[model samples]
Target: GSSGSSGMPNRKASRNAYYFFVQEKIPELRRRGLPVARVADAIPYCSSDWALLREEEKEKYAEMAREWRAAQGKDPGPSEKQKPVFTSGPSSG
Candidate 1:
């Protein structure tokens, strides 16, 4: 069974509230003016802060996620094609 034949990109994925929460923190974390800082380092801080957030506050991001999900529909994203990384054998074989 075939539905359609359209080449689509994987740009319709919906993010969860936790994702939005971290995204919001990224800029502020980057602006902290630490000697050296990376998002990886800031992740734990974001997680702890997320944990401390009030339910009402978290709900705001959840609402954004929900709205995005509704707007995007069922398709999550694009499917990736697997390519052979290495081949070891006689080329003539």
Candidate 2:
């Protein structure tokens, strides 16, 4: 079904989280006139990309997720929150 612009082009990442990437990637694939089935199968690749994304790229998805969720009235936590990128000094907290 048509998932309810793209949720005001702003929202939060659901707890399931996967939807964030799926929604964004699906349309991109569709823009090429790709079949829905093929697009669906490739969602896995989208998730992998999400993991491999650079900080800059990830910010885009995070922003979309944040906005999408906010549109749902969830107002999810900051999507731009930076996780520790490196730590190796017996830092086990």
Candidate 3:
């Protein structure tokens, strides 16, 4: 699905709410004496929690995302991609 320079995964100069949440959540858990390995193992739980959170509940992470966007002046969003020149392309599926 990717090639050339854009194929590389790089954070934008900014990020979304869940992204901010994960970045902070990991360290906070560790600070409370959770082992690094344990913290790493907990991401699936954290992600599920984030997804299940109510709209009003997301403000903390939303605020962080807003602050990041403000400082970074917005990411350009997705990278540019050229349209396929031909459709006879064998279906990989």
Candidate 4:
């Protein structure tokens, strides 16, 4: 029957969606100490706990940001990636 042929809402699609969601959340999680690699290890089980911990860490960072600015003070130094200034003349034979 076509009804049952749908087959659990496409496992690959679900997995892809899950992967994308995890990837999107990972950087913020890493900044807060909940590394995505650790979460990836506990997959297929205890995922809910991983999610909860991510939420907690996000909230912790938010609270910290509320208490203090995240940016460094006014620019006291040159930009980290400033390009080098070449003063050499054109190559001469």
**Top TM-score: which candidate number?**
1
Order of candidate numbers by lDDT, starting with the best: 1, 3, 2, 4
TM-score of 2: 0.36
For model 1, what is the alpha-carbon lDDT of residue 46? 72
User: What would the per-residue lDDT of candidate 4 be over residues 1-83, giving only the tens digit for each residue?
Assistant: 12221112223422333343454556656676653564353242334433444444545445444333323224544333325
lDDT of each: 0.60, 0.53, 0.56, 0.41
- What would the per-residue lDDT of candidate 1 be over residues 25-56, giving only the tens digit for each residue? 77787777632264445556576567766666
Please write out the lDDT profile of model 2 over residues 1-93, one tens digit for every residue: 332212212233352244556666776766766654543454554655556555555565676666656655655454434455643356568
Name the top lDDT candidate.
Answer: 1
Better of 1 and 4 by lDDT: 1
lDDT of 4 at 18: 37
Pick out the ten consecutive residues of candidate 1 with the lowest summed lDDT: 4-13
Report model 1's TM-score to 2 decimal places. Answer: 0.50
Q: Each model's TM-score?
A: 0.50, 0.36, 0.40, 0.27
For residues 1-93, could you state the per-residue lDDT of candidate 3 as single tens digits?
232221122344445666666666777667766654543344553665566665555765776577756655545553332344533345778
User: In terms of TM-score, how similar is model 3 to the real structure?
Assistant: 0.40
